[PDB]
Design a protein around this ligand. Structure first.
Ligand SMILES: Nc1ncnc2c1ncn2[C@H]1C[C@H](O)[C@@H](COP(=O)(O)OC[C@H]2O[C@@H](n3cnc4c(N)ncnc43)C[C@@H]2O)O1
Lengths: 232, 232, 233, 232
């Protein structure tokens, strides 16, 4: 399918594939099986902010999820991404549901990347339009009017759908490393609103990186976050 | 063809269509006929820089072209681009030759846009990659090997070609003005080498703004700068 | 005294000295007499936002002040600041009160300057202020901190703001504002603010200013002179 | 003296104090003995760039020193700067000479810091003017006319003096870290020309962080890089 590097906000403990007994945050290289997890304290109904950072000098792809109360989840992964992604990729946001469900409402999304050899990209979405000409949208992802990006299906009465999946990706393919680059570095941030009413909500939100032509790998609702075509 | 708002570095004095009887810089709205021109003193074989600035509050469209020596040309035009551009555009560069020719070699290209309602796009190319996936090149425009975007066709021994039109469009649509935003604005910078040993070289370089789906009007080589299909 | 170049949010109609008969916004070159005014429609007790844009190529200095409900205000002014201000200045925020009063609560302050000669550039942004802010020269009744806010005019424990107050806040470093090398010498500056009162009118307002590195509140610049000018000249 | 954290471009193999026996770059914490080092092939008279990076999330400090023909050098140190620097600091540059001598010529210097709760500071010198009011100069450091900050004393004929200490500190302080800070991260950049025909040259260039009131320690000339009061 694609080649994927992603940041998982697993709200549901899918443990026969392999997720610890609780909600967590993970680093995925080419698999739904996180190379690294951290316990996360999903705070329902509140707006949280996520930051992801990587430089190719320190080689440690990192992630932070927090809330205004202050609760913070953190994970690291030493890696030369250099070895997993192509010279050209796209950047996007992913979120799914299944049996259990939640809203997946992104209120803003800002990303930056440089190749200090410079070449650099810096886009930042603080409010989303009804028709957003610079976002490829796949799956149940749809925007506007309340100004927000809605990654997963939400009906009229503020009710999240079971078995939904959606993705939004910036229009322009992002050069992310080169042979020329002395420093291949990126950062990316998003402010989300997960709120449900189940036992535990499901399934999560992910920031992702992959090949320019990445679509949804069919049958990736629920526990696969609309990212992988199997749980291998 | 398409809608245009552009900035000409008009080198060849095509006066049976309204150019002044000399090399000039000028602001064109919807026409190869500049609403304001200024005496440019071209400096052949040298590396110059153009800045274009527009802020939607004071509504003044501005342009500067300078050489390292210290010589500068300037041209203003007050206007609510509000009435000439659509909500969504594309941005790029254009150069052309006809009977007399020149090199049209962009060394760097950068652009920023914001909607302080904030939304913002900011790209900067200090080198041009061989297969540069985030550029929509059209006509004889091609990157590569020297590090540079060759807008008009050049032969192997460095000898430029006549009757050659070239264009380079940054990949993404660019929200340029919003109903919603309090301040809509942009800036655009580029470095060039124009070299020839003709009587006057021809025809000149342009930064342009036009509707997302924009293509070179046929027969727009030379004096029309790969921007307009009539001389109206 | 100093050099001032500022933008006033002139809430009180000081007219025996030449504002007009309403809350306005003005470009002030070296005079509390604004070279250009535009009607502003004060929306008491809401957070508004100002942008102040200047490029050296266009030579037009602009101002916008708006509220959430989208109510706008615009004024511009053609000028070469090349030739008023010197090569080096300080930049800041000023407010005042008098026989009438208001909160002068700045919530965020941001400023960016460039000399496109590969550039010399300065970008700072204040989304929180702190109980100490080692990078903000604080003059007069000014105080950061505690609620998170820069407090330019005296407020008390009871939310009740004090009449006849004056304050200034300035970034700690000088700013190369224009050079003889610079093809473009350009700034922009943004702030968000909360002005609340109850008096017949409130007074007196908020201003963004540029002046010499050594600038300091002129004596008796409380009230209609915004902690900006030693005379009504 | 005060408190230091720095990145050393150690050009002289000082070994009765620790330096590995060759030109290197090192991360120094509160001691001239680098807690980390890496071999660097000093390229005489050529212009090189150093990038430094740290994010409080992944807690890894990074340095690259490279010349334009591709040759790099890398060294990394995991550390919680919570612990070593204070809420408030000054950012500055240092170099020195001793028994042996070199040109300590900085051709550009830029730094950025943020507190992503955003509070941010972003400054950059691409040309150093003669009288510069935003720099604190210390020791033998001087600027202007040629366009470059001269960290150690060079006389008229361009002959670099032996036994010279110099420092340049950016005027305003920097909030490096706070308690509210969910992320607090920085990066620096500088371009430099070290030229000499000594035996081995000396002593090297360093980027530093330290407290607002910091100044050159007495007899910190030569092998101490104008940073440390003793060789401990
Ligand atoms: N809406 C925003 N949100 C969050 N950060 C923002 C935003 N808007 C600007 N920033 C900033 C923060 C970073 O400094 C920079 C990221 O890199 P770029 O790839 O654009 O390179 C550096 C930028 O910083 C500028 N700056 C101006 N002059 C010099 C300079 N000489 N060196 C470095 N940076 C400079 C120009 C470049 O656009 O963009």
């Amino acid at each position: 399918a694609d080649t994927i590097v992603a940041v998982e906000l697993d709200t549901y403990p899918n443990t026969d594939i392999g997720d610890p007994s609780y909600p967590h945050i993970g680093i995925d290289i080419k698999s739904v099986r996180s190379k690294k997890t951290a316990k996360w304290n999903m705070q329902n109904g509140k707006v949280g902010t996520a930051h992801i950072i990587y430089n190719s000098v320190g080689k440690r792809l990192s992630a932070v999820v927090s809330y205004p109360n202050g609760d913070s989840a953190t994970v690291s992964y030493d890696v030369d991404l250099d070895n997993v992604l192509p010279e050209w990729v796209r950047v996007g946001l992913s979120a799914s549901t299944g049996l259990y469900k939640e809203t997946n409402t992104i209120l803003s999304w800002s990303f930056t990347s440089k190749l200090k050899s410079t070449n650099a990209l810096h886009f930042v979405f603080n409010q989303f339009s009804k028709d957003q000409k610079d976002l490829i949208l796949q799956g149940d992802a749809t925007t506007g009017t309340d100004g927000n990006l809605e990654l997963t299906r939400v009906s009229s009465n503020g009710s999240p759908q079971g078995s939904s999946v959606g993705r939004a990706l910036f229009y322009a393919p992002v050069h992310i490393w080169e042979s020329s680059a002395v420093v291949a570095s990126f950062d990316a941030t998003f402010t989300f609103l997960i709120k449900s009413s189940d036992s535990h909500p499901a399934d999560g939100i992910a920031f992702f990186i992959s090949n320019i032509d990445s679509s949804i790998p069919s049958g990736s609702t629920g526990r696969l976050l609309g990212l992988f075509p199997d749980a291998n």
